[PDB]
Symmetry: C4
Subunit: 82 residues, 4 copies
């Protein structure tokens, strides 16, 4: 896949994760964006995490859709910076 397409795909993931955490778990937009990156990068500090059943299901969907997308995007970003 072209690198710019990979960019759009991870941006879509980030929008999905951020809006979902904000509306389901009720955290601020900024916290939700931070949490989304921390989650799809697999860092997972746990300072924020879902505490409702819907949030838990949503987080599983973000894990399945986002970890692989993020991994490819960072590998591509490596090529253009190195």
């Amino acid at each position: 896949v072209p690198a710019t397409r990979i960019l759009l795909l991870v941006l879509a993931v980030i929008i999905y994760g951020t809006a979902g955490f904000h509306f389901i778990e009720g955290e601020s937009w900024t916290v939700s964006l931070y949490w989304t990156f921390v989650t799809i990068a697999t860092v997972g500090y746990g300072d924020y995490s879902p505490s409702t059943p819907l949030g838990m299901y949503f987080t599983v969907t973000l894990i399945v859709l986002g970890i692989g997308t993020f991994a490819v995007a960072v590998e591509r970003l490596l090529e253009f910076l190195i």
Copy 2:
């Protein structure tokens, strides 16, 4: 390996992790499924984790059997969605 076989393998991992956490650590089925994905994806928030010696041993077995299986499944899922 065919992608559908990889699917069955990660599903078996998920059943194993979920039933094990539920019965050993006594968390609900839903929490246990959430914890299983959080663990095999290596996100590891730590909002849930084993607090008994048997749970710790079991979690090591899930880590060894499940992280690699999950990694392959997400890579394959990437091919069919992209």
Copy 3:
């Protein structure tokens, strides 16, 4: 890329992460260095994490710039030790 260049790149990442956490979140130099490795390796214990909006933004930048760099450096280190 030559392995020594990869070394310099991860060292630059480590300096960036350490100085940034120290000045933005006000933790000690030693804690900040520890946190930087824990973050770019994706271990993410969460014993330390940013609690300010600027720290959260900075941590996202470190995640994007550092996880891929660290992954390549450990793979290269594997070749020279094995």
Copy 4:
């Protein structure tokens, strides 16, 4: 590298991580073994983590030496089980 050699290398990593956490941070042998796997797999729940400067330095060394070794071992284990 032959798969059996990779096995010995990760076993050496596990001994190093376990004995080090036990003696530096004073946790039990069993907790220390659990923590070692949780760390080199990059799960990093944070239910256990070093709280002394020496423990933090040691944990960085385990992160650098162990994450790559564990990754190769799980990939090899995947071949013999699948």
